[PDB]
Amino acid sequence: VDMNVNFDDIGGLDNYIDQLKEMVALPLLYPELYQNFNITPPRGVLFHGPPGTGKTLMARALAASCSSDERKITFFMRKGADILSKWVGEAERQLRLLFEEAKKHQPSIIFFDEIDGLAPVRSSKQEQIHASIVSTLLALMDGMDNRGQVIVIGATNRPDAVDPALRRPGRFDREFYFPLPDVKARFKILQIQTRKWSSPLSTNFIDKLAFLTKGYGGADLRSLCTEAALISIQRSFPQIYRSNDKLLVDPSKIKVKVSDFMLALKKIVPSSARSTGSSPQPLPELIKPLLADQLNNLKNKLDYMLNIKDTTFQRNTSLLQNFIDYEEYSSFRSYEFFESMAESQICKPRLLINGPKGNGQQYVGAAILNYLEEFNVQNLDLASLVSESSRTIEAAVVQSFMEAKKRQPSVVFIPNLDIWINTIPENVILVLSGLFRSLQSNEKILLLCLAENLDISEVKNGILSDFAFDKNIFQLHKPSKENITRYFSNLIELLKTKPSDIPMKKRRVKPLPELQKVKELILTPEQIKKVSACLIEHCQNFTVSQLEDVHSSVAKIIWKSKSAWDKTGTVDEIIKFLS
């Protein structure tokens, strides 16, 4: 955990790399520029984000990248709260020694991993053992004497657990949020992990993997690549898994194929799925004909509410690159006026999706959350509120809304609003509404709620009246005839397939070599048309759930006779079922 990593290993965090250069490498090479204004370079950064986003990798790359020249950067790394012992002496004494030896080797980086355990928040009881550590840490990090060129880096899952006196200029003046990688950063991470391989993958395959890995972190992508490689080893040379002696194998023709990555995709569960909220994922390919017609409309509406496709201001992905490629150009009437009139476009982002019971709302919500890739999703659903048994409903709601306030582009998500307004206490809705009306108009905190058979009277003169769902109510109407036709057309395409097409795996004729130790398908188109007509007629004024039920029931019948070439039996069974 010391070396052999650099900044080309890191993918999708190019904005923070520039600032870390600006605080570590740049002062060393150019001390005249910093001393020109009599400023001290910022020292100490608090990395926080979802686990497996690259904080420790970022710190190691900082330590090993700025030391490429003949200016060594010693890297003192401390695990979370591993310094306190059973007595009262060593806890502060060892921190003292750490900072003194950091002073000795003047260009140095102390990395407190999991700093939330070393410096907890001051609770009601058990004060001494952690207060005596926090006080001395505060004393050495911003003492009277010049600490020197010691860059203090802390890493945490959440920053609220660190003492606020640490989150102060001179100690932790910069706080870096490491976000879950988007599609481009995931593409770059996949390219990086599959860079040293002997048989590189194609670019389009990496793009498709990046699309398929929505919700993954960097760590999840690395685990996926490792699992794909392990499956490739298992597929090429299974014999090494049986013998206890080292057989002779060749690191060749062990190229990874798509089938191995697909299997690793089911073997790996992301950190998105471990969470209790709704995992943002695109519309599954089966239901896409049914819903995508009315999902695009929502996107268009969202496009007119959050100004997603109209991004001329607040396009800050990387300030340094902006200064590199773009070019500047009285003062107030050219910056303040236009900035204000650009942020004046978001008034009060709200959206309530309300459809009949079972009309694929769990699907539309996930698709919308996937479209808003750059937004910070906060789930106010019942499961997330009640999952932390120590917290209360009100406390969880306040925590979620306050988290959504920072990281301004964010979405407060309330799936199953009809259940939510019936199982939550009446005062929590009032607290949330007071929080939302205590917001500025130009704030991009979208309130997206999905409800099943919600009465409009409850929104007009009920408890949800003070959320301002006036024009922002979208009705998810039942799917039309053409979408049902496309759904069952895919079903029929499954029906009229030859058994030589349906993938049956194998039965190998010859055993694996030992290693040296060291008919025609009969289906008239008339029957296909009759089955299509019966499916269309049976599902009249049906929702998405009923259509899925009919699809599953018919797919069972079709897959039953997946080898029979005379498909009249499956056809008459299908017709009999729809009666």
Ligand X SMILES: Nc1ncnc2c1ncn2[C@@H]1O[C@H](COP(=O)(O)OP(=O)(O)O)[C@@H](O)[C@H]1O
C-alpha count within 13 angstroms, C-beta hemisphere, residue 398: 10
Q: List b or e across 22-43, with b for residues whose CB sees 16 or more CB atoms inside 10 angstroms.
A: ebbbbbeeeeeeeeeeeeeebb
Q: Which does 487 bind (CB under 5 to 8 A by kind): its own copies, ligand X, none?
A: none
Q: Which of 27, 44, 54, 159 binds ligand X (CB under 6 A)?
A: 54
Q: What is the DSSP letter of 89?
A: S
Contact 380, 412 (CB under 8 A): yes
Question: Site map for its own copies, 313-342, x if CB under 8 A?
Answer: ------xx-xxxxxxxx-x--xxx-x-xxx
> Of residues 113-142, which lie at the interface with ligand X (CB under 6 A)?
142
CB 16, min distance to ligand X, A: 10
Contact 98, 110 (CB under 8 A): yes
Choose between 329 and 526: whose C-beta lies nearer to its own copies.
329
CB 142, min distance to its own copies, A: 7
What length does the chain have? Answer: 579
Which one-letter amino acid corresponds to residue 400? S
The residue among 55, 62, 70 whose CA lies nearest residue 6 is 62
Q: Which of 24, 25, 43, 53 binds ligand X (CB under 6 A)?
A: 53
CB 418, min distance to ligand X, A: 38
Choose between 56 and 232: whose C-beta lies nearer to ligand X.
56
For the chain, the straight-line distance linking the first and the last C-alpha, in angstroms and rounded, comes to 67
Question: Site map for ligand X, 56-95, x if CB under 6 A?
Answer: xx--------------------------------------
Q: Which does 2 bind (CB under 5 to 8 A by kind): its own copies, ligand X, none?
A: its own copies
Which one-letter amino acid corresponds to residue 164? P
Q: State the Cα–Cα distance between residues 56 and 9, nearest whole angstrom.
A: 12
Q: Which of 148, 165, 462, 496 binds its own copies (CB under 8 A)?
A: 165
Report the run of H or E that residue 131 belongs to, with start and end: helix 128-141
Question: Is residue 358 classed as helix, strand or coil in its secondary structure?
Answer: coil
Question: Site map for ligand X, 202-241, x if CB under 6 A?
Answer: ----------------xx--x-------------------
Q: Which does 514 bind (CB under 5 to 8 A by kind): its own copies, ligand X, none?
A: none
Q: Which of 23, 46, 115, 189 binds ligand X (CB under 6 A)?
A: 189
CB 109, min distance to ligand X, A: 15
> Does residue number 257 form part of the binding site for ligand X (CB under 6 A)?
no
Q: State the Cα–Cα distance between residues 26 and 414, nearest whole angstrom.
A: 46
Region of 10-18, 229-237, 430-438, 442-450 interacting with ligand X (CB under 6 A): 10-18
Region of 62-70, 180-188, 517-525, 531-539 interacting with its own copies (CB under 8 A): 62-70
Q: Which residues pair with 385 in a beta bridge?
A: none
Q: Which of 30, 106, 456, 460 binds its own copies (CB under 8 A)?
A: 30
Report the run of H or E that residue 451 belongs to, with start and end: strand 445-452
Sheet with 74-78: strands ordered across: 74-78, 108-112, 150-156, 45-48, 174-177
Residue 50 labelled as part of a binding site: yes
Q: State the Cα–Cα distance between residues 472 and 301, nearest whole angstrom.
A: 9
> Does residue number 551 form part of the binding site for its own copies (CB under 8 A)?
yes
Residue 52 labelled as part of a binding site: yes
Binding site for ligand X (CB under 6 A): 9-13, 51-57, 142, 170, 181, 189, 192, 218-219, 222
Annotated binding site for ATP: 49-56
